[PDB]
Amino acid sequence: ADHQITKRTDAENMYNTIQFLSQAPRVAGSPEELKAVRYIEQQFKSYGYHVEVQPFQFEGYTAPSEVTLKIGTEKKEGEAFTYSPNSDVTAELVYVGLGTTADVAGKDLNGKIALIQRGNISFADKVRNAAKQGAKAVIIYNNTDGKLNGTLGGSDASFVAAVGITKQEGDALAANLRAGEKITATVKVAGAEVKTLTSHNVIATKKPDANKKNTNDIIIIGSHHDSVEKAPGANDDASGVAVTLELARVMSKLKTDTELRFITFGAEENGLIGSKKYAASLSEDEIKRTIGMFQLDMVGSKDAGDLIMYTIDGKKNRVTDLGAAASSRLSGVLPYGQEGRSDHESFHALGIPAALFIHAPVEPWYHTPNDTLDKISKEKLDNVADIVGSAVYQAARPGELVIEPIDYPRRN
Ligand SMILES: CC(C)C[C@H](NC(=O)[C@@H](O)[C@@H](N)Cc1ccccc1)C(=O)O
Ligand SMILES: [Zn+2]
Ligand SMILES: [Zn+2]
Ligand SMILES: [Zn+2]
Ligand SMILES: [Zn+2]
Ligand SMILES: [Zn+2]
Ligand SMILES: [Zn+2]
């Protein structure tokens, strides 16, 4: 049965999809993402699919024009967290540890600037916990090398300007403060803006067309069509979109007894907003009938490692079972592990079996201007299309679903 898939997986088609999409970054809610939505819609239609476009709004963030951080007189390097309010305050710097509700409860942060170490809780809670105590600004320092780049999740007037700094420059201040030194700091954040944007999810569905063998099962195959600022997003995630489109094309040539929904989600980089919106559109019946959701994210880089399947809880499910089965016949052992960070999380949250298919360890180009077309491997795109497509087909082909017993290891 795999031959029905492997003989039709066109790597040139997939390469071409990535070439068109990665001509420029596709920031969620931007004209470029809209352009991608129209392109994807048109390709699905060309395969003969009926397509639906689900719109949704979300709070976008415009980075501040300038982030000025100063300890007394010396100027330090700091990057304002996304969704960070604006500020122009100069006051005493107070170390409050991890910024837990307790760490700040015993301290006097009224009108002062809090110094918080990254860890345990989310950056959002730290800023929130410190702001509730009267803190006018927050300085968070790294746990590892390199700048501290994070997000407060989304807009929230309960926040106060928050900027991150390295571990070295952070442990130093914390030490000086612990030693009893009285330090003053300046946190000026200007330019930052929050705006309401509109993104979209593209949904192409193939209804079962088998004889009396039709089931009421549903399988979802997804990827996200947006990319981060400044990143052409060839592999993250035009690659996933390319495989999603090609598999949709492949399946249109075959009879199926299982409803297939090929979807490209918007605003994934903003917090899986698109997939959360689509998941919220499903009825209780659709939820219980969805036997599996396959997420394709970063599946074409020549500079990434072997293919692996990630599940939210690190446990095996119907999707990893099918993925493992297909791979055992086509390429060998396909390991599984625990990881979220992608659209599969949105379906796992509803109890639907789900897994992320990705090449790990990931390439160094991830989220950089270097995530381009010349890093893409047609051979890997084709292999993923072969494995995921055969796994889906093992279920979608006419007849009853049978999954033979096979062992596949968990990899951390
Ligand atoms: C909650 C999400 C915004 C998480 C976010 N996800 C992404 O960027 C996706 O494009 C995925 N590429 C996340 C990812 C990266 C590397 C290995 C596994 C999973 C991320 O920061 O990784
Ligand atoms: Zn092929
Ligand atoms: Zn629209
Ligand atoms: Zn991604
Ligand atoms: Zn990403
Ligand atoms: Zn080769
Ligand atoms: Zn192949």
374 burial (CB, 10 Å; 0-12 / 13-18 / 19+) is exposed
**Residue type for position 344:** H
Question: Which of 296, 216, 311, 234 lies closest to 264 in space, CA to CA?
Answer: 296
**Residue 244 C-alpha to ligand 7 middle, in angstroms?**
15
Contact 384, 307 (CB under 8 A): yes
Question: Which of 6, 11, 19 lies closest to 377 in space, CA to CA?
Answer: 11
Q: Give me the phi and psi of 20, to 5 degrees please.
A: -65, -50
Do 289 and 158 sit in the same domain of this protein? Answer: no
Provide the domain limits for residue 323.
Answer: 1-64+192-412
For atom 8 of ligand 1, the residue with the nearest CA is 269
Number of structural domains found in the chain: 2
Distance of CA 203 to the CA centre of its chain: 18
Do 82 and 121 sit in the same domain of this protein? Answer: yes
**In this structure, what CATH number is given to the domain that contains residue 91?**
3.50.30.30
Contact 376, 300 (CB under 8 A): yes
361: tokens are 């360890």
Do 87 and 165 sit in the same domain of this protein? Answer: yes
Q: Show which of 134, 160, 191 is a domain's final residue.
A: 191
Q: How many residues does the chain have?
A: 412
H-run or E-run covering 18: helix 11-21
CB-based pocket (< 6 A), ligand 1: 236-237, 268-269, 271-272, 297-298, 339, 341-342, 358, 362
Do 97 and 52 sit in the same domain of this protein? Answer: no
Q: Give 93-100 contacts, CB < 8 A, sequence gap 24+.
A: 93/139, 93/173, 93/177, 93/183, 93/184, 93/185, 94/135, 94/177, 95/173, 95/174, 95/177, 95/178, 96/130, 98/126, 99/125, 99/126, 99/127, 99/129, 99/130, 99/138, 99/140, 100/129
- Structure determination technique employed: X-ray
Question: Which of 147, 82, 77, 86 lies closest to 118 in space, CA to CA?
Answer: 147
Question: Which of 30, 41, 19, 22 lies closest to 262 in space, CA to CA?
Answer: 41
Do 222 and 137 sit in the same domain of this protein? Answer: no
Do 277 and 254 sit in the same domain of this protein? Answer: yes
231: tokens are 């990143």
For atom 5 of ligand 1, the residue with the nearest CA is 341
Which of ligand 1's atoms lies nearest the C-alpha of 345? 1
Do 73 and 218 sit in the same domain of this protein? Answer: no
Do 148 and 259 sit in the same domain of this protein? Answer: no
Distance CA 342, CA 358 (A): 10
DSSP-derived 3-state class of residue 71: strand
Roughly how many angstroms between the first and final C-alpha of the chain, as a whole number? 32
Distance CA 410, CA 320 (A): 11
Do 412 and 289 sit in the same domain of this protein? Answer: yes
Cβ contacts of residue 16 below 8 Å, gap of 6+?
none
Do 157 and 144 sit in the same domain of this protein? Answer: yes
Do 294 and 331 sit in the same domain of this protein? Answer: yes
Distance CA 188, CA 65 (A): 11
Distance CA 189, CA 77 (A): 13
H-run or E-run covering 402: none
Task: Give the torsion sign (CA, 90, 92, 95, 100).
Answer: negative
Q: Show which of 157, 191, 225 is a domain's final residue.
A: 191
Strand partners, 37: none
Distance CA 50, CA 45 (A): 6
**In this structure, what CATH number is given to the domain that contains residue 39?**
3.40.630.10
Q: Show which of 191, 225, 260 is a domain's final residue.
A: 191
Distance CA 204, CA 392 (A): 16
- φ/ψ bin of 208: left (φ > 0), alpha (ψ from -120 to 50), beta (otherwise): beta
Do 103 and 177 sit in the same domain of this protein? Answer: yes
Pocket test for ligand 1, best of 341, 345, 346, 358 (most atoms within 8 A of CB): 341
